[PDB]
Amino acid sequence: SIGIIDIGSNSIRLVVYDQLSRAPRILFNEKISAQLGRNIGRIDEKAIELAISELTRFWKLAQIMELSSLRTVATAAVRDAKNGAFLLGEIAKIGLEVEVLSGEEEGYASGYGVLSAIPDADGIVGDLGGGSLELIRVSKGRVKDRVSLPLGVLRIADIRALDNFISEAFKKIDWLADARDLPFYMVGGAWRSLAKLDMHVRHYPIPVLHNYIMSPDRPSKLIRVIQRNNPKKLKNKANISTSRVEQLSDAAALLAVVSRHLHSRALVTSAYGLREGLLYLSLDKATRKLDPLLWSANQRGETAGRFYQQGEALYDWMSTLFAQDPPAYHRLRHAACLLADSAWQANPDFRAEQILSIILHGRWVGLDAYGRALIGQALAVSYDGAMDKKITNNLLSEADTIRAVRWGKAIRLGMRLSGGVTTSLKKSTILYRNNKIILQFSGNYKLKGETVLRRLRSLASSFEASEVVEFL
Ligand SMILES: [Mg+2]
Ligand SMILES: [Mg+2]
Numbered sequence: 001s002i003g004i005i006d007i008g009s010n011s012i013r014l015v016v017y018d019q020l021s022r023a024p025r026i027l028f029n030e031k032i033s034a035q036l037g038r039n040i041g042r043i044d045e046k047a048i049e050l051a052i053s054e055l056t057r058f059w060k061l062a063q064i065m066e067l068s069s070l071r072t073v074a075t076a077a078v079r080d081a082k083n084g085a086f087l088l089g090e091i092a093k094i095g096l097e098v099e100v101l102s103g104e105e106e107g108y109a110s111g112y113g114v115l116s117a118i119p120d121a122d123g124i125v126g127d128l129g130g131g132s133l134e135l136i137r138v139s140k141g142r143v144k145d146r147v148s149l150p151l152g153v154l155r156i157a158d159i160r161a162l163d164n165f166i167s168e169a170f171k172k173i174d175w176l177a178d179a180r181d182l183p184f185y186m187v188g189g190a191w192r193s194l195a196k197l198d199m200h201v202r203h204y205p206i207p208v209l210h211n212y213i214m215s216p217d218r219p220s221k222l223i224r225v226i227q228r229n230n231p232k233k234l235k236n237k238a239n240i241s242t243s244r245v246e247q248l249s250d251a252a253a254l255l256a257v258v259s260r261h262l263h264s265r266a267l268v269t270s271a272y273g274l275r276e277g278l279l280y281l282s283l284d285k286a287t288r289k290l291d292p293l294l295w296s297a298n299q300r301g302e303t304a305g306r307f308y309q310q311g312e313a314l315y316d317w318m319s320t321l322f323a324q325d326p327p328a329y330h331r332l333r334h335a336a337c338l339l340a341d342s343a344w345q346a347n348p349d350f351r352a353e354q355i356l357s358i359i360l361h362g363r364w365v366g367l368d369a370y371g372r373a374l375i376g377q378a379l380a381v382s383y384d385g386a387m388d389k390k391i392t393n394n395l396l397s398e399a400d401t402i403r404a405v406r407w408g409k410a411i412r413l414g415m416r417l418s419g420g421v422t423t424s425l426k427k428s429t430i431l432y433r434n435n436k437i438i439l440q441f442s443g444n445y446k447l448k449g450e451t452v453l454r455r456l457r458s459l460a461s462s463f464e465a466s467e468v469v470e471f472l
Helices: 045-064 084-092 103-117 153-159 162-171 174-179 189-202 218-227 231-237 245-262 274-282 292-304 311-321 327-338 348-360 369-382 398-418 422-427 451-462
Strands: 002-007 012-017 026-032 069-075 098-101 123-128 133-139 142-149 183-187 266-269 428-433 436-441 466-471
Touching: 002 045, 002 274, 012 045, 012 274, 026 045, 045 069, 045 084, 069 274, 084 098, 098 103, 103 123, 103 133, 103 142, 103 183, 103 274, 123 189, 123 245, 133 245, 153 162, 153 245, 162 245, 174 245, 183 189, 183 245, 189 218, 189 245, 189 266, 218 231, 218 245, 231 245, 292 311, 292 327, 311 327, 311 398, 311 422, 311 428, 327 369, 327 398, 348 369, 369 398, 398 422, 398 428, 398 451, 422 428, 436 451, 451 466
Parallel strands: 002 069, 069 098, 123 183, 183 266, 436 466
Antiparallel strands: 002 012, 012 026, 123 133, 133 142, 428 436
């Protein structure tokens, strides 16, 4: 239902989202490699010709998709070309009014994009685009400070000396000194592509874009990877075809110098950038505070489940076993319960495989790799799978491996007992007391049956407990 066209100096992108919601699904995403800024200074005719044809396609797609809103933004970089104002008028005649973003508006959108995907972010956001580097301090749910620098990807080759430029620029930014030893949240296409390169180079058994973590030493090592490889093979094998390898080398150099000068403790990818920041700021303010993992997992069980979303009564029912879970884990148990019906159409013996890829390889935010592994292994267990551990890179502690097995067995007992109509679990309680796992019925006694209690035996076994069924 909504579209954003993001015009930069090094590429243009259309993204269509299913609705304006807390965590919307991407229906369509197309990046164009026209480089409006390369000829600064004047934008060259052939760039303009490429851009107007592509933008006209973006307009036409918006018409046939019947979008409820299409927003077009451009950077000040493009506007301030000698002929920038003329190009903006040529775009308007397509039917696309261009909203030119100041440095302030650009940095605020990129920073709230990271806060949308990572609500607890506390660090510096770096948006490396074609024409600018935006640096944004985020803390406490807010953008706190911001600077816009002329260090886009196109500008890096002209300098790269790179250390001295950053050193000089950084001296004038007085808030960097209070922001040391914090994460560096990377957004923009070049740095997201560099993280995909790192995943490939490292063979990291969970290739998650969102919240992928890199040491501050990785960028310097990636420069050497690019130099030590055939550029064509590297791009294709790492799934970053369309990236310009020379630009990626420049991006890595900049990342190394910026990270060192900011004293970044970790480099963290955000799947949400400027475009998702615009959406977040378009929300009602109270909607912004909703948890985007649980929002997105709720929507998935609504659209995929047999009886829409029944995970709420399931989470309520199973959580009396899990009251002592660490504070951060309750929302992960909840997200697993919301997704507990999402592989029902698969043949029984492959549902564990499916649900695991949905969790590990879905576009979830508000979650790190360890959390994906926890939810994914709980849900694999819920669908009668063993736990590979090598697909999850042995990330999990033994305590949390036991915890995931217990979550998964409780989920599947609840799902099998209720048939998936989890409202009926409102008349039941499942408890761990005195070395017993006790399924209590205060009502819906007819659900008990006999065979389904094999799931209770399994759960009891994972607790080293006596299976008990009690009617109250
Ligand atoms: Mg940008
Ligand atoms: Mg920019």
